[PDB]
Structure formats: C-alpha cells, structure tokens
Design a protein around this motif. Sequence first.
Motif, PDB file in Angstrom:
ATOM      1  N   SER A  97       0.831  -1.203   0.000  1.00 27.68           N
ATOM      2  CA  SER A  97       0.000   0.000   0.000  1.00 27.68           C
ATOM      3  C   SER A  97       0.862   1.247   0.000  1.00 27.68           C
ATOM      4  CB  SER A  97      -0.896   0.018   1.229  1.00 27.68           C
ATOM      5  OG  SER A  97      -1.851  -1.005   1.148  1.00 27.68           O
ATOM      6  N   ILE A  98       0.657   2.109  -0.996  1.00 34.26           N
ATOM      7  CA  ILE A  98       1.375   3.374  -1.089  1.00 34.26           C
ATOM      8  C   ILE A  98       0.360   4.510  -1.123  1.00 34.26           C
ATOM      9  CG2 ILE A  98       3.050   4.760  -2.322  1.00 34.26           C
ATOM     10  CD1 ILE A  98       4.064   2.127  -3.577  1.00 34.26           C
ATOM     11  N   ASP A  99       0.217   5.206  -0.004  1.00 34.52           N
ATOM     12  CA  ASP A  99      -0.670   6.360   0.088  1.00 34.52           C
ATOM     13  C   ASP A  99      -0.026   7.541  -0.613  1.00 34.52           C
ATOM     14  OD1 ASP A  99      -1.597   5.783   3.590  1.00 34.52           O
ATOM     15  OD2 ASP A  99      -2.311   4.811   1.751  1.00 34.52           O
ATOM     16  N   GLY A 100      -0.769   8.236  -1.460  1.00 34.06           N
ATOM     17  CA  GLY A 100      -0.220   9.411  -2.097  1.00 34.06           C
ATOM     18  C   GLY A 100      -1.300  10.265  -2.730  1.00 34.06           C
ATOM     19  N   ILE A 101      -0.893  11.373  -3.343  1.00 32.87           N
ATOM     20  CA  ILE A 101      -1.834  12.309  -3.948  1.00 32.87           C
ATOM     21  C   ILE A 101      -1.680  12.355  -5.458  1.00 32.87           C
ATOM     22  CG2 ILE A 101      -1.982  13.597  -1.825  1.00 32.87           C
ATOM     23  CD1 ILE A 101      -0.379  15.875  -3.292  1.00 32.87           C
ATOM     24  N   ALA A 102      -2.807  12.500  -6.147  1.00 33.87           N
ATOM     25  CA  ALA A 102      -2.793  12.707  -7.586  1.00 33.87           C
ATOM     26  C   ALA A 102      -2.661  14.199  -7.812  1.00 33.87           C
ATOM     27  CB  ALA A 102      -4.064  12.171  -8.205  1.00 33.87           C
ATOM     28  N   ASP A 103      -1.505  14.616  -8.325  1.00 29.77           N
ATOM     29  CA  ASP A 103      -1.157  16.035  -8.359  1.00 29.77           C
ATOM     30  C   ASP A 103      -0.647  16.461  -9.734  1.00 29.77           C
ATOM     31  OD1 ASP A 103       0.979  18.182  -6.310  1.00 29.77           O
ATOM     32  OD2 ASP A 103      -0.394  18.595  -7.962  1.00 29.77           O
ATOM     33  N   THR A 104      -1.537  17.040 -10.524  1.00 26.99           N
ATOM     34  CA  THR A 104      -1.164  17.495 -11.851  1.00 26.99           C
ATOM     35  C   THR A 104      -0.170  18.650 -11.829  1.00 26.99           C
ATOM     36  OG1 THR A 104      -3.073  18.999 -11.979  1.00 26.99           O
ATOM     37  CG2 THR A 104      -3.370  16.788 -12.903  1.00 26.99           C
ATOM     38  N   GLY A 105      -0.069  19.359 -10.704  1.00 21.75           N
ATOM     39  CA  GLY A 105       0.863  20.462 -10.591  1.00 21.75           C
ATOM     40  C   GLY A 105       2.278  20.114 -10.140  1.00 21.75           C
ATOM     41  N   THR A 106       2.560  18.828  -9.957  1.00 21.35           N
ATOM     42  CA  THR A 106       3.903  18.363  -9.652  1.00 21.35           C
ATOM     43  C   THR A 106       4.422  17.606 -10.870  1.00 21.35           C
ATOM     44  OG1 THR A 106       3.580  18.239  -7.251  1.00 21.35           O
ATOM     45  CG2 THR A 106       5.252  16.790  -8.189  1.00 21.35           C
ATOM     46  N   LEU A 109       7.146  15.438 -11.255  1.00 19.04           N
ATOM     47  CA  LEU A 109       7.730  14.109 -11.108  1.00 19.04           C
ATOM     48  C   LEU A 109       6.896  13.183 -10.232  1.00 19.04           C
ATOM     49  CD1 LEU A 109      11.503  15.013 -10.746  1.00 19.04           C
ATOM     50  CD2 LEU A 109      10.083  14.809 -12.819  1.00 19.04           C
ATOM     51  N   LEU A 110       7.360  11.947 -10.128  1.00 17.72           N
ATOM     52  CA  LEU A 110       6.736  10.914  -9.305  1.00 17.72           C
ATOM     53  C   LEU A 110       7.598  10.741  -8.050  1.00 17.72           C
ATOM     54  CD1 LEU A 110       4.832   8.527  -8.698  1.00 17.72           C
ATOM     55  CD2 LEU A 110       6.064   7.197 -10.382  1.00 17.72           C
ATOM     56  N   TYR A 111       7.027  11.043  -6.887  1.00 14.53           N
ATOM     57  CA  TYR A 111       7.747  10.985  -5.619  1.00 14.53           C
ATOM     58  C   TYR A 111       7.190   9.848  -4.778  1.00 14.53           C
ATOM     59  CZ  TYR A 111       9.591  15.573  -6.833  1.00 14.53           C
ATOM     60  OH  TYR A 111      10.223  16.610  -7.481  1.00 14.53           O
ATOM     61  N   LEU A 112       8.047   8.872  -4.479  1.00 15.53           N
ATOM     62  CA  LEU A 112       7.619   7.640  -3.818  1.00 15.53           C
ATOM     63  C   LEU A 112       8.577   7.307  -2.674  1.00 15.53           C
ATOM     64  CD1 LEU A 112       6.628   5.525  -6.969  1.00 15.53           C
ATOM     65  CD2 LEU A 112       5.048   6.518  -5.298  1.00 15.53           C
ATOM     66  N   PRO A 113       8.210   6.341  -1.825  1.00 17.37           N
ATOM     67  CA  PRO A 113       9.082   6.020  -0.690  1.00 17.37           C
ATOM     68  C   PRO A 113      10.479   5.615  -1.129  1.00 17.37           C
ATOM     69  CG  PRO A 113       6.919   5.074  -0.359  1.00 17.37           C
ATOM     70  CD  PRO A 113       6.954   5.571  -1.775  1.00 17.37           C
ATOM     71  N   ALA A 114      11.457   5.889  -0.276  1.00 16.19           N
ATOM     72  CA  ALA A 114      12.855   5.669  -0.618  1.00 16.19           C
ATOM     73  C   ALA A 114      13.127   4.222  -1.007  1.00 16.19           C
ATOM     74  CB  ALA A 114      13.742   6.077   0.529  1.00 16.19           C
ATOM     75  N   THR A 115      12.445   3.282  -0.359  1.00 20.03           N
ATOM     76  CA  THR A 115      12.597   1.866  -0.694  1.00 20.03           C
ATOM     77  C   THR A 115      12.231   1.581  -2.155  1.00 20.03           C
ATOM     78  OG1 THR A 115      10.404   1.619   0.235  1.00 20.03           O
ATOM     79  CG2 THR A 115      12.259   0.929   1.636  1.00 20.03           C
ATOM     80  N   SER A 142      12.683  10.256  -4.485  1.00 15.00           N
ATOM     81  CA  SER A 142      12.223   9.926  -3.151  1.00 15.00           C
ATOM     82  C   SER A 142      11.326  11.011  -2.588  1.00 15.00           C
ATOM     83  CB  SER A 142      13.416   9.745  -2.220  1.00 15.00           C
ATOM     84  OG  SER A 142      12.963   9.477  -0.911  1.00 15.00           O
ATOM     85  N   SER A 143      10.241  10.586  -1.941  1.00 18.28           N
ATOM     86  CA  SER A 143       9.382  11.492  -1.192  1.00 18.28           C
ATOM     87  C   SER A 143       9.852  11.727   0.243  1.00 18.28           C
ATOM     88  CB  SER A 143       7.968  10.921  -1.130  1.00 18.28           C
ATOM     89  OG  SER A 143       7.969   9.729  -0.381  1.00 18.28           O
ATOM     90  N   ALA A 144      10.962  11.125   0.651  1.00 17.30           N
ATOM     91  CA  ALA A 144      11.385  11.222   2.045  1.00 17.30           C
ATOM     92  C   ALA A 144      11.671  12.684   2.353  1.00 17.30           C
ATOM     93  CB  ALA A 144      12.600  10.369   2.285  1.00 17.30           C
ATOM     94  N   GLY A 145      11.104  13.203   3.424  1.00 17.30           N
ATOM     95  CA  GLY A 145      11.283  14.615   3.701  1.00 17.30           C
ATOM     96  C   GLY A 145      10.335  15.556   2.964  1.00 17.30           C
TER      97      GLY A 145
END
Length: 330
Positions: free
Chosen positions: A213-222, A224-230, A296-299
């Motif tokens: 499970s990867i919780d995240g937001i659908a964001d047309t204004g960003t 790139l794809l930012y995901l957990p460091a793993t 990475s989305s970390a931070g």
Amino acid sequence: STGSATTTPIDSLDDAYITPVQIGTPAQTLNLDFDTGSSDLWVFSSETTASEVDGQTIYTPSKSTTAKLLSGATWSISYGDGSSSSGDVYTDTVSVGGLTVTGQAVESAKKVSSSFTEDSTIDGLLGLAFSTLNTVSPTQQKTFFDNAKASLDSPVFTADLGYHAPGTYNFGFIDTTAYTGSITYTAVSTKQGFWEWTSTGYAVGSGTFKSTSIDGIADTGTTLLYLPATVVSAYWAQVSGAKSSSSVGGYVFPCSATLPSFTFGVGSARIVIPGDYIDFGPISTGSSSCFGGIQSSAGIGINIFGDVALKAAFVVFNGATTPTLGFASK
C-alpha cells in the motif's frame, strides 16, 4: 454543462502544462497551470510588482466589466517546491473550454516568488484540489470545479496529459474514446484536502509486482513521481550507473542508459509508465548526467503521483458526494 480544453506542455521536458482560461468581460485569456494539488485560482495581474513580471500575460481587472473587488480578502500560498505568491481577490466570470462560472474568486498576485517570474509561460494557477485548502482570508473561497459542479452533467473532471504532446482537461463528462479498456476506481480521502488515494503496489521493468500500500496524492501540478525511498531505490538499482546525488538534488543516471518502465497498481489494475517518461534530460546543458523522473518522497512528508505518473493514464477526478479517482490506460 460541460467544458473541454487542451493542455499543452510548457517545454520539451513536460515540466508543466498550461491550459487557456478566459477571465473577465471582454475575455482576457491567460494560460494557467491546472493544479490538482492546490485550491487557489491566482493570476499575474496589473497589480503584480512590476519587477516580478517577465513575459507573462496579466489579468487587468479594471478592464473587465464583470470584475468586482472582494473587499478585505487576501491570499497567500506556499507550494511544496518552495515557491509562493500572494495578493488580493476579485470575483469575475471564468470560462474553461466553454464552461462558464460567474462569481469565481480570481486571486490577483501582488507578489510572486522568483520561480514564477522566471517562467514566462505560466500566467497563474488554477487549483483543483478540495476547497478546504483555499487560502483566501477571512472568507475561504471555492475552486472553479466546486463552483461549476452543480451545473455539470456529471460532477467530474478528467486529466489526460500528453507525453511530449498536448492533452485535454474535460469537465462534466467522461470521454469514452480517450482511453483503452476499463476505468478502475479507487477510494479517496479528503482529510488533507488532496485527491489522496492508496496504490496497491509497483513493479520495475519486467519484474514481479510487489503488493504494498502506497498512500499518495494525484497532483497534476507536480512534475515528477515521488515515492518512498525503498521503492525509488529498487527502481534506480536497475539502471547501471544511477545514483542519488545530494549536490544535484536527487537520482541521476547516465544519459546513455535505457530506462526501465515503472508500473503502479490501482486496485487490481496496473498503469505502466514507459521508461522514456522517466527521463528528464541532462542536469545542465551538455551534461552526460541525466535527471530521473522518479524521486524519493522522504522529507516531503507525502507521496506524490505527479505528471510522470498521471500522463501514463486517463484520470477521472470524481467529485461526487463520496469522491473517488479513476485510472485507465490509454
């Protein structure tokens, strides 16, 4: 009612997309960045500090017969990339792709940060997250979508972003010719004001799918794809010579590489991001080090399904009483 407008990348890297918007009477057409990760419609204007305008088209409320100062209202916003803007507020008529809202809050910038000034192609933002994030004080204002909703044939909008090509934002209908197969819908939490959902996992290239499970937001204004460091480490481990560079600010890879695809899960369905979508080109002109599109989305504090992910799909933002998100391949 419905609306349909073409959205066009601002540059050869798809760093953002602009969509023409008609504001005022007679119409003043500004090219706005439709942003499903924020909830303010703000524009460069005749009130913007002159030194902070560099080539943008401005909204001039004094030339609009339908503009009215929203007395006492101010706004101020900061985005996840550190950029910001602020000013005062007018109400005016706003149309997108033939769909018209009267009395829309049009937030006029008095100040913008350098990143906005330096981007001559973006004349403002049109927020499409939930109105609870709108920054107008002391009276919070509704988004264009929220205002339009009751008049729409169906309470939805769709994002169909192109890879190095124009795409489309539709309001009030689902274009069944614009995608392949079926649309898979998934639950949305509005608790943080975003189109927040949970992906069911990922795969790297032709690798096996990892259910997680990867919780995240659908964001047309960003971008790139930012995901957990793993997850991000598992991706870049498949690219010879790729590495995370603190000096550059993320993962880089040899420009000579062929990038693998990245698959993300939507329920039991799968969206495949081709490897080419993950290439953001040389870090500086002439460099043989290229910038990665998965970071990475970390931070950051949140995972972000930005344009890299969304442009691989036809995406339904369903604003029914219980909102949901739909994804189809295309």
